[PDB]
Symmetry: C3
Subunit: 158 residues, 3 copies
Amino acid sequence: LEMRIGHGFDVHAFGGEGPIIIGGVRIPYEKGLLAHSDGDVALHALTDALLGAAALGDIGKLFPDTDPAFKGADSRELLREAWRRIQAKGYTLGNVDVTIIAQAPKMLPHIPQMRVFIAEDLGCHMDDVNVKATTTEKLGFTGRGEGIACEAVALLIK
Amino acid sequence: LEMRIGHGFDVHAFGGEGPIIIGGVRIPYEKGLLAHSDGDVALHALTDALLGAAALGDIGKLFPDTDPAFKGADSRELLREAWRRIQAKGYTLGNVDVTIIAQAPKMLPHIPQMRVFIAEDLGCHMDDVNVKATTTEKLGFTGRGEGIACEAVALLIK
Amino acid sequence: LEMRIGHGFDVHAFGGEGPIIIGGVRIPYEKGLLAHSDGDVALHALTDALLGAAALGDIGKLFPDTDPAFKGADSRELLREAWRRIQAKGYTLGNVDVTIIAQAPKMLPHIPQMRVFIAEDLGCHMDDVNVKATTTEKLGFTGRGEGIACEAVALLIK
Ligand SMILES: Nc1ccn([C@H]2O[C@@H](CO)[C@@H](OP(=O)(O)O)[C@H]2O)c(=O)n1
Ligand SMILES: Nc1ccn([C@H]2O[C@@H](CO)[C@@H](OP(=O)(O)O)[C@H]2O)c(=O)n1
Ligand SMILES: Nc1ccn([C@H]2O[C@@H](CO)[C@@H](OP(=O)(O)O)[C@H]2O)c(=O)n1
Ligand SMILES: CC(C)=CCC/C(C)=C/COP(=O)(O)OP(=O)(O)O
Ligand SMILES: [Zn+2]
Ligand SMILES: [Zn+2]
Ligand SMILES: [Zn+2]
């Protein structure tokens, strides 16, 4: 039983009309998120943590914004595809932990649904998916309501 | 032997008269920390990493600022209580690592005491508790002396 | 088989003439990095994650900027020395994951070389070293091109 750790981080700036997509869930908000994809900060960061633990780089090394086969995809498709490739290397899920960093909107009413999505997408028990949120007390780009950041850690078994 | 990873993050803005409480230790400083609790950034982040690894959410899902049974509590009481509940689910401590991010005050004279507190609170060997500090070279809200951030990772055994 | 987790974080401000050193690799850029050492943000953060997992503190607790035996050293020497001391306590490498946070320069052409360096320095398979990069979408000190941050997680075996 060999175990492997992975870390992920992601940021998107606010812009345009709401809602926003975080952890798969459509959340109502005054602004939306500027992004090439659906801008799901929490799922990008989670994917990068998963891929990192499998030493497969990051999303931008598997699915280039520029090209070729994976354009106009929502972050759940990318998560599920990354997870196929991680399973292809003979890994199974240990567990994942996600930390959303945003002044607003309010995340925790939506966390149960984020966990349902992630557990479906990775085909695991909800009990192995943890998601949490925090503000930076009106400090920083995130606290000035300029954008949202997220951190993810993942553990994989072989 | 199943192992589980957890991550935590926390920020508090400076305000009011010093001292500040970081990792349990009262540290002298020109300003204090604005917070509902004692504002112990390092212990919040550690608790969230612990709870996250046990898939129990975060502090704000166990001990709502709003309510009900756990108001006006210092961060060590919250840490110790979270640790009871994590033990209640049959987990024991692997180890924890804490990273304080602050331009000032100077953290490392206080780290040995922070480790004594944390090891007591979690009833473990000092050898499983690591705490470190870093500045952001006068960059960012943290570098402009606006506040303090902290990151924690935790590993739990079952 | 006991396993241990570690986290690291590091920031350096831009200044002076390029190039910059990130993960051992000399990368061309309009500015350089202000630092006492070579300013290799990615290797500092990795070292701190490694040392943290071994409960040995951080670089600034093993190799004080002030003093005594380890001045004017490039970050690879420090990484290799920290790794001797971690091996001295009977640890072997699980794996490491690195996340560079910079608006520019562009990191991923250089990641393969960063992995060659790190794998050499820790005497491990490339397959246990993962490095990735992300921007913060022009947000924050990092997005305003003021500096570069990095995050590292490490896992150690005993
Ligand atoms: N300094 C930097 C900053 C970011 N990047 C990124 O290039 C992108 C790949 O198209 C990005 O992937 P990402 O969109 O964050 O999934 C990261 O690899 C990079 O390569 N160098
Ligand atoms: N966008 C956000 C940002 C922060 N939060 C927080 O609500 C708080 C619960 O009272 C907070 O918990 P915390 O005070 O960080 O322990 C986190 O869950 C949240 O729910 N949504
Ligand atoms: N509030 C803070 C912020 C940073 N520090 C740092 O002191 C330095 C040791 O010379 C630093 O180590 P570093 O240069 O980040 O490897 C960290 O321990 C500290 O001790 N207290
Ligand atoms: C790992 C960390 C620190 C996560 C939190 C992200 C955050 C709030 C950064 C602060 O923004 P900034 O310092 O990059 O920009 P500014 O100087 O405008 O506050
Ligand atoms: Zn993204
Ligand atoms: Zn707090
Ligand atoms: Zn440094």
